[PDB]
Amino acid sequence: PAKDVQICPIAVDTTVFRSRTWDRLKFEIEYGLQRGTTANSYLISADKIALFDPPGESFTDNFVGTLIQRLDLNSLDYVILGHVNANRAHTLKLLLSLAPQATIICSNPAAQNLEKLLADAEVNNPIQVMKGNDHLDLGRGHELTFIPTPSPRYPGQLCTYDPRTEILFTDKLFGAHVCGDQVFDEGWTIYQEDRRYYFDCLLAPAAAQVSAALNKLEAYPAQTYAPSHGPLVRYGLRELTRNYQQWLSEQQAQALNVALIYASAYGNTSTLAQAIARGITKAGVAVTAINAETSNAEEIKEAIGKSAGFIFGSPTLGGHAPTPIQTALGITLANASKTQLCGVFGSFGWSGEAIDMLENKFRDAGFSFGFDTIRVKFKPTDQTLKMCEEAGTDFAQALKKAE
Ligand SMILES: [Cl-]
């Protein structure tokens, strides 16, 4: 059917707003099972009123339209962000015009990102940054605790625990891209494929960071996970968590590993990276995704230190690679043995010099390539993604053959 907003009370003072779509939201590998999705927003209305995670651009208008019918937006005290991107920032522009009094609650990386993304918006709501073990009291026992859970794709990711309701707001962790009528997750098997596919696409290339996150989240006695996507996780909570533990262990235990180092200004090269990673992991080879824009030098040395191959993905910005890709290249060249398999991909518009530069440097430095250098003009399509996944598989097979 058409996009809607499903509203449901879920705990004391707590309501979920699920923006639902039965169609494919984006051309991203994670939407591949084509079972639709939801973007979940949450409202805690106590002595103070907090809204978690307004949905992105496809959902902006239905969401604001629905929300104003339920809430006087001038009474909104807080907008809490589990993560930040241009997609979400679009909704925030409208929402914060209507709720000029509200304070933004988010992680420090999310904050810098938001400040960038809203540089030319007129909105100037204040931001309160939260780090681990910070609190925010909404009254009536809802003393929230914050838990940064960063990953290469979501550097600003922030989880939130509400002890009054025993809900852990988990943002991108523990979700599933599936649109259904059930607000809650009764039944294990119907969601099992979606949950594993979600893990495989989003989390497997960030296994060390995701393990670290789950380690922190164990300290909170959650009875429910309230994720960005899919049903709320109540009936499948323990089972899903044990499966995560097992899947993470599998990932970090595979004999071969690929360092996939990328950057992306508008998301295109990132979309390609996800696809290539999935082709690699589905072939039984681990991926350590590195977002060069947010990573540090020791991160890269470490990744290159344990990898059997490395792959660079880069956009072209004024005819050059982004600065973080240039510096990552140096660390890589300074540390990688010439026996590592090499790959190059990227998206571009008018020109793709960054790709050419990287291919040349790696060839000159005597590396063997595991797939033909990938060049995508502007926005990736379904076909593009499948080709990239197949390249990742190809890369993986080439590594396995080498032992
Ligand atoms: Cl983020």
From Swiss-Prot:
Protein name, per record: Putative diflavin flavoprotein A 3
Cofactor binding notes: Binds 2 iron ions per subunit.
Keywords: Electron transport, Oxidoreductase, Transport
Coiled coil: none
Source organism, top-level taxon: Bacteria
Segments forming domain Flavodoxin-like: 258-396
EC number from the UniProt entry: 1.-.-.-
Keyword Transmembrane helix found: no
Other observations noted: By homology with NorV in E.coli, may be involved in nitric oxide detoxification.
Organism the protein comes from: Synechocystis sp. (strain ATCC 27184 / PCC 6803 / Kazusa)
Function field: Mediates electron transfer from NADH to oxygen, reducing it to water. This modular protein has 3 redox cofactors, in other organisms the same activity requires 2 or 3 proteins.
Cofactor: Fe cation
Family according to the record: In the N-terminal section; belongs to the zinc metallo-hydrolase group 3 family.
Region described as Zinc metallo-hydrolase: spans on this chain: 34-229
GO MF annotation terms: electron transfer activity; FMN binding; oxidoreductase activity, acting on the CH-NH group of donors, NAD or NADP as acceptor
